[PDB]
Every structure is written in structure tokens, then in C-alpha cells.
Design a binder for this molecule. Structure first.
Ligand code: U4C
Ligand code: W2M
Lengths: 154, 39
């Protein structure tokens, strides 16, 4: 399957079939977070997807081609996390991002908590463009989880 | 062995559930790709 859209990433190496993450198929390239696959090859029916680019520090990886997602959060508007939780239907959650302030600049962040196997779920703007992937973040004072809006470079 | 399964289209949903706060946090990103809170 090469149809554009959001996909679950599954494994049969553990008990039963386990969802280890999520990813985005766009322009013939599969995009996910590095910690989901660890850079391993993936299967799509009879087809094989080989890693093309990856970076542990950005925590991103692309398959079949270079990273294609280049839209960015505008810093003002609400966005939607298209959450694909393990065993559950894809669901859109609208939110106003917070900010991660770092020594190298600011990044948007979403304060939404889902099972770890939801990592790789896309965050979208009002045009339906993917502005980043959910799943690399921190646990704050409250004990709640906050994910960076992680985007690659096209 | 890992495999992918389609889960949906990527579209904005009008009248989606609205939730989550917007915290401003000072953070650090290490060479292993881990974020940590700076205080
Ligand atoms: O601390 C966590 N890490 C995590 C890692 C990737 C994606 C989503 C999450 C949320 C989670 C798992 C369940 C409780 N909070
Ligand atoms: O906040 C959550 N949302 C959620 C959504 C779908 C399935 C399971 C969960 C549990 C929880 C709490 C700790 C792990 N994530």
C-alpha cells in the first residue's frame, strides 16, 4: 500500500500483534519517529520499505525517499493531533500548542497524553498539512506528558 | 518483523474535541534525542 495517509506500525515479535507506533505516507515516502522502528526495514503487504534517511537526535526516519514534510506551526493557531492509539480508531484532537524553549530556538509542543505506541501520529494545521510528529517529549511537574511538534527538513 | 496498516486520511476535522493546555517550558535536547526539563 502506497496510498497517502496515516498508518499503524505493527510487530509480531512480542505477544500477539503489537502496535509500536504510527507514521505518515506522503509523496511515496513513509515518515515516522526513529524510536518506533530503530531504523529497521518495514513490510507493506508483500512489499519492503527500506530506510532512506534518519537521525537519532531529531528522532526521525524516512523510508523509500527523503523527508517530504515541510509545513510548520505558525506559532499562533490551534492545531490537531491525528491520534492513532493502539487498538483504537484514528481520532482528531484540537489543541493550542505550548512551547519548548531551548538554547537553539523555540519549538511548538502539544500537551496530550496517549499510550507510547501512538508515537509517530501526525500533528496538522487547518490546511491538513503535517507540521510534525507526536511522541518525543517530557514529563512535567504536574506529572503530565508534553510532546514536541517534531518536524524534519525537506 | 515490522509491518504497516492504513489507519486513515490526513484531514482537519471541523468540530473535533478541543483539549490540552499550552505550557511554556525550558528544555534541553541531548545527543541521544532525549528531552529534559531545565529548572
Ligand atoms: O510518558 C510517556 N511517554 C510517551 C512516549 C511516546 C509517546 C507517548 C508517551 C506518553 C507516555 C506513555 C504513557 C504515559 N505517558
Ligand atoms: O491519558 C491517556 N490516554 C489514553 C488514550 C487512549 C488509550 C489509553 C490512554 C491512557 C493514557 C493515560 C496513561 C497512558 N495514556
Amino acid at each position: 500500500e502506497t496510498t497517502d495517509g496515516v498508518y499503524r506500525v505493527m510487530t509480531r515479535r512480542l505477544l500477539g500483534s503489537t502496535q509500536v507506533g504510527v507514521g505518515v505516507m506522503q509523496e511515496g515516502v513513509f515518515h515516522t519517529m526513529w524510536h518506533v522502528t530503530k531504523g529497521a526495514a518495514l513490510r507493506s503487504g508483500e512489499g519492503r520499505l527500506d530506510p532512506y534517511w534518519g537521525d537519532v537526535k531529531q528522532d526521525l526516519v524516512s523510508y523509500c525517499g527523503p523527508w517530504k514534510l515541510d509545513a510548520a506551526w505558525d506559532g499562533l493557531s490551534e492545531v490537531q493531533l491525528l491520534a492513532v492509539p493502539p487498538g483504537e480508531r484514528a481520532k482528531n484532537i484540537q489543541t493550542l500548542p505550548g512551547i519548548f524553549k531551548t538554547k537553539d530556538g523555540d519549538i511548538g509542543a502539544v500537551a496530550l497524553d496517549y499510550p507510547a505506541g501512538t508515537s509517530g501520529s501526525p500533528i496538522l494545521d487547518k490546511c491538513g498539512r503535517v507540521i510534525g510528529l507526536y511522541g518525543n517529549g517530557v514529563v512535567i511537574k504536574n506529572g503530565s506528558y508534553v510532546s514536541a511538534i517534531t518536524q524534519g527538513k525537506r | 518483523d515490522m509491518y504497516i496498516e492504513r489507519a486513515g486520511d490526513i484531514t482537519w476535522e471541523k468540530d473535533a474535541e478541543v483539549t490540552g493546555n499550552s505550557p511554556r517550558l525550558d528544555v534541553a535536547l541531548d545527543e541521544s534525542g532525549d528531552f529534559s526539563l531545565v529548572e
